[PDB]
Coordinates of C-alpha atoms in Angstrom, one line a residue:
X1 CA 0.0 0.0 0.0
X2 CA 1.2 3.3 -1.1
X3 CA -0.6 4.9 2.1
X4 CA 0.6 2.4 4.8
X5 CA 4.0 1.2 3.6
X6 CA 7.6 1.9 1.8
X7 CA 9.1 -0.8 -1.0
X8 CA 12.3 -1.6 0.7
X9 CA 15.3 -2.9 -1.6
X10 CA 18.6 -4.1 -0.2
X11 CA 21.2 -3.5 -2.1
X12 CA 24.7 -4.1 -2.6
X13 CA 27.7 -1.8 -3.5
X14 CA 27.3 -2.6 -7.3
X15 CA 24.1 -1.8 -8.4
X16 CA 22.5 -5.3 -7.7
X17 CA 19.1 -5.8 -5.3
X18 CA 20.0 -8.9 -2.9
X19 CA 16.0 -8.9 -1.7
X20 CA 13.4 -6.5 -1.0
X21 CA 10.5 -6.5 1.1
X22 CA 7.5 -3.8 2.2
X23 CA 7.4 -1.9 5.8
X24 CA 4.5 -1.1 7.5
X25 CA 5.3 2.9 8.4
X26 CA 2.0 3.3 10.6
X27 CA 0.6 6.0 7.9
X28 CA -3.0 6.4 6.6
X29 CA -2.1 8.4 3.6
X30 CA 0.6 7.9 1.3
X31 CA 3.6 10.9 1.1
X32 CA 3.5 11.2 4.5
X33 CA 6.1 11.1 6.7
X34 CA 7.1 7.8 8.3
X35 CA 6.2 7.5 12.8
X36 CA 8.8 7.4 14.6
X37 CA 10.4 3.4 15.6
X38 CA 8.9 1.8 12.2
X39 CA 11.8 2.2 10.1
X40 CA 14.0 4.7 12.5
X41 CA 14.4 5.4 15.6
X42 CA 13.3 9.3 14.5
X43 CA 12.0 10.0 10.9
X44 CA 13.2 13.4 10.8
X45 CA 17.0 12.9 12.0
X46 CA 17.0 8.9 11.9
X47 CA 20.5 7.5 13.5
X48 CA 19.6 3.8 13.8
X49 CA 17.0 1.2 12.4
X50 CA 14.0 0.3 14.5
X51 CA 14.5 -3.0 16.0
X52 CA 11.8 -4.8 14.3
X53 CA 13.4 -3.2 11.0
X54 CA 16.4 -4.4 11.4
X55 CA 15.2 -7.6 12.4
X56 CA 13.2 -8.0 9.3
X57 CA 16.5 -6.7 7.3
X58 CA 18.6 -9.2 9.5
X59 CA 15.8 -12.2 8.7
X60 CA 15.5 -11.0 4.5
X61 CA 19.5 -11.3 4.8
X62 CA 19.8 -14.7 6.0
X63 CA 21.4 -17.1 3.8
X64 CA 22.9 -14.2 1.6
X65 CA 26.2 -13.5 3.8
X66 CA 25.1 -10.0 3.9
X67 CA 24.5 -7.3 6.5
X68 CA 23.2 -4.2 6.6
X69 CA 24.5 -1.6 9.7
X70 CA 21.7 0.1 10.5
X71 CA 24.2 3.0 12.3
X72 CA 25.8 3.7 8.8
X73 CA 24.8 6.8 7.8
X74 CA 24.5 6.0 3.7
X75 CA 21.8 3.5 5.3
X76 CA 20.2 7.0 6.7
X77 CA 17.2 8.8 4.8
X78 CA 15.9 11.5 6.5
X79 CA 11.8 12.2 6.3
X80 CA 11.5 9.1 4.8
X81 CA 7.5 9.1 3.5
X82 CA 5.2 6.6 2.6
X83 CA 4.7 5.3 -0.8
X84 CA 8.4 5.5 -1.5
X85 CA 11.2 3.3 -2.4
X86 CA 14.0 3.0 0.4
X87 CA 17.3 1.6 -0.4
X88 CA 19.9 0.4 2.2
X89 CA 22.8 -1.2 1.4
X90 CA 25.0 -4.7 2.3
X91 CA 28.2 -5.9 2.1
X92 CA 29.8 -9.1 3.0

């Protein structure tokens, strides 16, 4: 749902999707800012993933010998909204 949720694509370093998946941002209305602890720990000046994002990156990543670090900062988009695309990215 463009109103409820963001597309979420892991990628790596070279242009490649490893998996994607959709997140539940706790909106009503699409291009609207993501609550706070869905995706971030704050939307508007986000510093780490949620926990239950990270988990569900963590889980999408099994097998793949990937990880994402949710502290990075290139893994950071601030005022994220709903309806978009997010894109974090892995390495080995």
């Amino acid at each position: 749902s463009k109103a409820s949720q963001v597309k979420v694509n892991i990628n790596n370093l070279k242009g490649e999707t490893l998996k994607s998946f959709n997140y539940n941002v706790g909106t009503n209305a699409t291009n609207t800012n993501a609550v706070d602890g869905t995706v971030y720990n704050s939307t508007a000046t986000p510093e780490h993933f949620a926990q239950g994002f990270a988990d569900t990156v963590n889980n999408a990543l099994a097998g793949t010998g990937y990880k994402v670090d949710g502290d990075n900062a290139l893994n950071h988009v601030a005022n994220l909204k709903s309806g978009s695309t997010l894109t974090i990215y892995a390495t080995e």
